[PDB]
């Protein structure tokens, strides 16, 4: 017969012209549809965007289906006869374009991704008959891109293609990675070659035949930097060999994205191949109707023998024409026991510089961080996460100085915001390189007043407040200058050798409590003028060999109403209410002047205020006042 | 008539072949001219650079007029009666393609942007006819990007677009946001549809018609992030609804490159009304000569009634013929009641890495910054400006921690090199993310001979000298670490708990004036070997309770000629010149043994060297060598 | 007589039917040949990446020969008295496109890497006959690009632009900076202009002239930074004139990608020509069969005879049929007077984001360093290099902070972890803006245990353990809080003013061996409560001038036998063994109450325990445990 257009609103309503359409091996085909009704205003709102079928009357009766969507529609002038529209058929998946995301998955293998991607959506006419497993992804962002570009790219990565089986009701994209996806048609599994010489031919055949070759790089080498394993050879190369000249020239990039050596040979194999898919292809002109972008065919009858095989569609363009029927179809093929990869076509995402996110983690924590000093991160664009431990996978943070098990350490803490850079602009590989303050997280010291101070100031951690921090911070104000250290428990100063103090002006040192101080060999003080002892208890010096007090011009030991001084000149005076001197042995008082006894030379001597324990204790309480 | 092409150097000189145009509304017209002349050598250079126009004649006597500027002509050969000349006009704006420059704007809208670029370069054939008011942009830069696409991108992103009016002498461009700021030309405010079957018409009309629609998505959802306000909500979304399936698909995008909720509302707007301007569009061939891009008119008299309405032209093709007149128009138009908006074609800068730039602030003063702790910056690719506080915006600086009045913090100074960053790429986003030392700005520590210290050494500030400064350092030469600590004036330490010191060798301490020391409770120290105390002054100590005093071998007491000297085995020897022994009460001298007055028993005792003041002050001056 | 075709396996066996040809100045040819043969079956892989040749002949008997490689190939089907066949001719650099590695080019000249490049892979059909020289290059990247970008871009980049001559048996890349590499073909060196009008003519002629002109920007300024010298002023600006008018607009880019004033002049001048090349450009049809691409031909008999000029073909089309002879090209030329430089049109690779490096140096040290704090390190994507100090060029570290002489400072060492970030994206200006730790280069502190801790540890070098170092470390963990001060070796501490130490509960201070403590002035020391002293050798001390010992309950001196007490009542006890008291003037004893000798009333006072040597000692060595 014809070929039926059937859609909404009728399958009665239109006439089909003209159709030309384009498909090809893991995209979205395009059906150019010229059409004719006897209504010169059918409503283009009631069949935009629902699906349209085109039915293509096969040998056995048996019908071949376009089935698509209308992206667009128009309605075209003409005179009284028939009026004249257009409208162009796309799959289901192009309606992925019409939306956009930003959006983080983890833990999922790329055909799980795209599932999902599709079910969120609403989406259901799709299959899997992949062959092979995939690596599951700890972190893949879809970022600012369409739904539509994120699927296909990552299908370009992972070596995954489709094509579509058109039903009368149904389009469905079958999601394939080796040969056992694709089949034959009835009545198409072998087509023949008949030269366009005869005139006419009765039977559904192919007309013209070109092959064509072309020099490719005959292999790919990929690496790539695992941190957790710094040492990892992680090289991969896959090679393709032809027997023509010039088949030798190496491929090589960075990074592979992989971190396992064998997703890394998956990966450089599937670029090699989708690159080697294109040397050698056929080019076949036919009337063959069955035979579609996806469908394995064998071609008979072909002068050049070799030639007569069986070939995999990778595209093909339609043309049909209806006088108010001829079918015929141009196509590209490679053989079937070549591997379809797709090419990198579709563009990947790419960060242009550092954004700034925030530090998160668990309800609980104020500080959340893993054996490698990681955190994580809540992005600004993210929009479907709980800001918690989920919220990103683990980023490493840069540091001031970082060595073998030595350096500087300051895990961001949850809350904070930070600088998040992105290795080689990958979205997929954030790395933390700055803190940065803001409105909320405020600067240490008040600025612009305290331009001047330089420094550290920490925070207790659980549940500390603005007084429980431990510091450094260093005053620049000229005049001013300042270094100050706190410890908001204790401090623990050890040094292995010699320690030196040198202060210029006043030291003034206040323990609250006890101080005992230990000297391991000798101790020697020197004061250039006066020296000053206050005790408010009991004082006791304890030498174990011999004690000597020297003094230039007196000394005196007062206490009470003992008083007790020497002095330079020799001249002795003890006084007291009694006294008392005994020895064991022989006691001797000698003078070479005169000795006298309560002649009356000798009286009491004076105290000169000092001994009494009330004044004393006056002067040392002076030294301690209350708060 | 036909139409006449007026030119310097002569209006009769040139005649019009053919000529063949395109307009399209925002973007720039072409026109190309192919044109003979009797002259066989009009001088290229004297019509190359300078307006060119065409003067077409319209019902009622009045023109239209082709204005523009000759960007390129061309002197192609010819046969003997007419030698053939071809030139392409473009507007004026097609010149700011011809000059670059890197240049930062501060608080301007982006009209008032637009206009100054306009102005600077001498243009002045324009118009302002924008309805909205625009926000004033505080940071906008112009950068690697020729002066037209500086003046497209912002005109695409505020919702700016522009149409050119054509006078004699004169094109302007029109600044456009609304319906307003067209027109319709006289004797075209409304153009009839006659088909062209009938043969022959005599007035202006169109004979072929097309509507089309296609799908597009239904809404556009835009975010950003405040420092100032890290917790406002400054997601934006912006709805257009369809009556057609499938026009409900989602978009998202971040950053919108806005702070305030409000103007980010109007750019979710401005964009996707961009998006669903191409959603239904109408297309029309015909001869009418007044209409051009930009204006509007009324069709009249098309079967479809609905469709003869009022329609703003979108873009226009045109084709003109003399022998030696025929003028046809295709037109692109959507419903006047629409509202246009310009897609996002012309490319945005983006500064793909980080860059160098320069601190700068005030003459007078040495650290320019903020509550934030933000810098401001000198660029090295911006050359209009003076290296002062009006060079760049507030700037933040990442630190080593940042978090809630806690954290790191090392203010960049006047004059310093930094390391900005770029948030997304955007030019218009600088962060500065690090610290580079120069030629000038040098390393502290001479390298390589110190590589191996590490620190933090700072400035006194203002007026600081290289001998003005506070630091830490840390020498790891093995065998000769040393870790060093400079308080320029005073240093404070503080611990509110224990304190401990542990000195492995030898202490050096050394007061240049007077310590005091203070102990709240009880004082303890040990001394394994010898004690040693020099006092060039007076020494006083005082104890509230009970002093106590003890040797296990001998306790003297020597000042001068009085020498006292206690023993282990219970000598008690005393000498002196004169002694004085006084009781109030009773006194008792009693021995085991004899008790000898003036025997002979009882000589001087030896000072052995000790208690002479002399030599004291000589031993004690030893400890404080001059100067 | 024709064109011939010899190739692989036989010239009588390919006889070329039609041929396309494209060939521009500094750009590859691309030659299409249809092609017929006697043979249905010569296979492709005979033929396919070998070598092609074309022999057009001349006037003379002379041979042109178009020579190249054959990149594909085609079968066509065929009736029976002919089969055909398609090849498409490239130049060999073409085939580094099947090429692509990351390389590092060290002080090498552009023309020195593209020689280098050539021979590498085996390329040996060039030469140079570059007349300017070309500066050497202290580092060169080839990132993420194929071998003919690489030495292209680097061309485009130096002005250095390519042609083509062909031998029978070889094709030669040409490479010129230059008017002087350019010659004529013999029998070339004037053509002549007939005009179509004259009908039909024999000899090798040109029948169709034009010449264009377009608005082109009159200047390019550049600009560049070279921390080096950072005052240094490194602006260059390169003009072209022009009579004609709008011919003076400038254009401006930074960063030149120079250091030295006089390479960006050049760099200026090359990318500003080159955009002038354009501005004039002569097209001629022809039949002339000598005439190419690199050629110089000049111009007679054409009506403007200011035309009749010398041209340097910059570009050829090209088309033969033949039946089973007719010639023509169209050349697109520049007066010879101008200057050629290419377009920048190979695309300049671009490192979107931040890497990893590992740090490398000599084989002895630990670590390497420069004058600037700079250091050498390995990139993951290098597989040429010997991880030593060749590896890559001086790079530049961020820091804390950074000043003239002053500020934070912490070198890289070898081995460590790096974060590598790239100026305006260039793979050729890499900045270290990181350090980052990872699975052998761990965190100071076991997290997450630690997480509490913040700090910065050192290393000793060289030969330094993981107990060799210099650190300070804050404890952040509620209610555990520490502060920490490790000095490997020796401790300076520097105050020029006020120092002060307040801790609020015990201070423990321990020193190994001595201590020395000195006071320039006043020393004063307050005990709220007890004082103890322990001393294991001998005590001494030493007044210059009044010594004071007061006590508010007693004053006891007790050693061994000898006891010695003062008391509040003034009650005053000496006990020994025996006494002796000796005066050189005279002695009073006197009582207020009664004197009594030998009563009884004086016995031995208690030693309480005290004065006993072993006790003493044992109470000192209790303070000095042993380990």
Redesign the interface.
């Given at each position: 017969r014809l070929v039926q257009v059937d859609c909404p609103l009728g399958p009665d309503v239109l006439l089909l012209q003209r159709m030309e359409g384009r498909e090809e091996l893991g995209r979205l085909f395009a059906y150019e549809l010229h059409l004719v009704s006897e209504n010169?205003?059918l409503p283009?709102?009631?069949l935009?965007?629902?699906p349209m079928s085109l039915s293509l009357e096969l040998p056995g009766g048996s019908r071949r289906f376009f089935h698509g969507?209308?992206?667009?529609?128009?309605?075209?002038?003409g005179?009284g006869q028939f009026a004249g529209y257009?409208a162009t058929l796309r799959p289901w998946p192009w309606?992925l374009t019409?939306?956009?995301?930003?959006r983080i998955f983890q833990n999922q293998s790329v055909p799980e991704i795209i599932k999902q991607v599709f079910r969120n959506?609403g989406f259901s006419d799709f299959e899997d008959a992949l062959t092979r497993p995939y690596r599951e992804w700890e972190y893949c962002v879809q970022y600012?891109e369409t739904s539509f570009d994120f699927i296909s790219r990552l299908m370009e990565q992972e070596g995954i293609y489709y094509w579509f089986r058109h039903e009368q009701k149904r389009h469905i994209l079958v999601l394939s990675d080796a040969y056992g996806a694709h089949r034959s048609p009835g009545g198409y599994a072998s087509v023949p070659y008949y030269?366009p010489?005869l005139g006419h031919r009765e039977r559904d055949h192919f007309f013209?035949?070109?092959?064509?070759?072309?020099?490719?790089?005959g292999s790919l080498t990929l690496?790539?930097?695992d941190?957790?394993?710094?040492?990892a050879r992680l090289?991969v190369r896959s090679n393709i060999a032809r027997?023509?000249?010039?088949?030798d020239?190496?491929?090589?990039?960075?990074?592979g994205e992989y971190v396992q050596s064998q997703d890394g040979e998956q990966y450089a194999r599937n670029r090699i191949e989708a690159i080697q898919a294109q040397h050698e292809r056929v080019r076949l002109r036919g009337v063959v109707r069955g035979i579609g972008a996806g469908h394995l065919f064998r071609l008979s009858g072909y002068?050049?023998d070799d030639q007569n095989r069986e070939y995999l569609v990778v595209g093909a363009e339609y043309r049909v024409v209806q006088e108010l029927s001829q079918f015929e179809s141009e196509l590209d093929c490679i053989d079937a026991s070549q591997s379809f990869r797709l090419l990198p076509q579709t563009p990947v995402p790419?960060?242009?510089?550092?954004?700034?996110a925030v530090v998160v983690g668990p309800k609980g924590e104020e500080?959340?961080?893993?054996?490698?000093?990681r955190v994580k991160v809540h992005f600004?664009?993210d929009?479907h996460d709980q800001s918690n431990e989920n919220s990103s996978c683990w980023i490493?943070?840069?540091?001031?100085?970082?060595?073998?098990?030595?350096?500087?350490?300051?895990?961001p803490?949850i809350?904070?915001?930070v600088?998040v850079?992105?290795?080689?602009?990958?979205p997929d590989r954030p790395?933390i390189?700055?803190?940065?303050?803001?409105?909320?997280?405020?600067?240490?010291?008040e600025?612009?007043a305290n331009?001047?101070?330089?420094?550290?100031?920490?925070?207790?951690?659980?549940?500390?407040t603005?007084a429980?921090?431990?510091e450094?911070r260093?005053?620049?104000?000229?005049?001013?200058?300042?270094?100050?250290?706190?410890?908001?428990?204790?401090?623990?100063?050890?040094?292995?050798?010699?320690?030196?103090?040198?202060?210029?002006?006043?030291?003034?040192?206040?323990?609250?409590?006890?101080?005992?101080?230990?000297?391991?060999?000798?101790?020697?003080?020197?004061?250039?003028?006066?020296?000053?002892?206050?005790?408010?208890?009991?004082?006791?010096?304890?030498?174990?060999?011999?004690?000597?007090?020297?003094?230039?011009?007196?000394?005196?030991?007062?206490?009470?109403?003992?008083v007790?001084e020497?002095?330079?000149?020799?001249?002795?005076?003890?006084?007291?209410?009694?006294?008392?001197?005994?020895?064991?042995?022989?006691?001797?008082?000698?003078?070479?002047?005169?000795?006298?006894?309560?002649?009356?030379?000798?009286?009491?001597?004076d105290a000169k205020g000092?001994?009494?324990?009330?004044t004393?204790?006056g002067?040392?309480?002076a030294?301690?006042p209350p708060p």
């Open positions: 010169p205003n283009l709102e009631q935009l965007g629902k969507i209308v992206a667009r529609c128009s309605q075209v002038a005179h257009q309606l019409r939306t956009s995301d930003c959506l600012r030269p010489t013209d035949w070109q092959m064509a070759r072309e020099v490719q790089p690496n790539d930097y941190f957790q394993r710094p040492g090289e027997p023509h000249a010039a088949a020239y190496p491929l090589y990039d960075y990074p002068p050049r790419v960060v242009r510089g550092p954004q700034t500080i959340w961080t893993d054996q490698y000093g600004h664009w929009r490493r943070v840069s540091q001031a100085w970082a060595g073998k098990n030595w350096g500087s350490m300051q895990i803490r809350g904070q915001e600088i850079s992105f290795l080689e602009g990958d790395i390189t700055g803190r940065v303050y803001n409105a909320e997280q405020t600067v240490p010291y600025l612009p331009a001047t101070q330089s420094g550290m100031k920490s925070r207790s951690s659980k549940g500390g603005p429980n921090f431990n450094i260093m005053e620049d104000k000229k005049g001013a200058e300042q270094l100050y250290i706190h410890a908001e428990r204790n401090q623990d100063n050890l040094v292995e050798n010699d320690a030196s103090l040198s202060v210029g002006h006043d030291r003034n040192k206040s323990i609250g409590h006890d101080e005992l101080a230990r000297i391991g060999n000798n101790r020697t003080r020197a004061v250039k003028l006066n020296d000053t002892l206050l005790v408010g208890g009991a004082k006791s010096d304890s030498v174990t060999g011999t004690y000597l007090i020297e003094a230039g011009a007196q000394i005196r030991l007062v206490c009470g109403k003992s007790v020497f002095n330079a000149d020799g001249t002795i005076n003890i006084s007291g209410s009694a006294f008392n001197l005994y020895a064991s042995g022989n006691g001797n008082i000698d003078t070479g002047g005169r000795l006298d006894l309560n002649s009356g030379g000798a009286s009491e001597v000092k001994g009494v324990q009330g004393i204790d002067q040392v309480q030294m301690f």
